[PDB]
Copies of this chain bind each other. A is one copy, B any other.
């Protein structure tokens, strides 16, 4: 498990911050704030130690800290750390990650 802002997730939970919502289009058209939904793009800031899926050993989570990941529409918990929004997810809920 890896901690972020003095917060360590438990079991296979993963903490992410969502990316910044896009404010202007590629042509130069500014977008209203209330029309921008939740960003499914996110980066991993903290992982838990993982669950015990098999007998006697700890299974680490599939993502690591700094991974750029894709989130589902629902299934995240609001976590406030130093007055900033963070979202806690189960490891199996992450749809995929972006490689570079």
Contact = CB atoms under 8 A, between A and B. Distances in A.
Given A53-B52, A77-B72, A98 B9 contact: no
Q: Classify chain A: how many residues form its interface, as a range.
A: 20 to 34
A98 B55 contact: no
A92 B70 CA distance: 21
Contacts of A98: 6-8
A8 B97 contact: yes
A10 B99 contact: no
B8 A96 contact: yes
Contacts of A46: 96
Interface of A: 3, 6-11, 13, 15, 46, 48-49, 52-56, 59, 62-63, 70, 72, 77, 79, 88, 92, 94-100
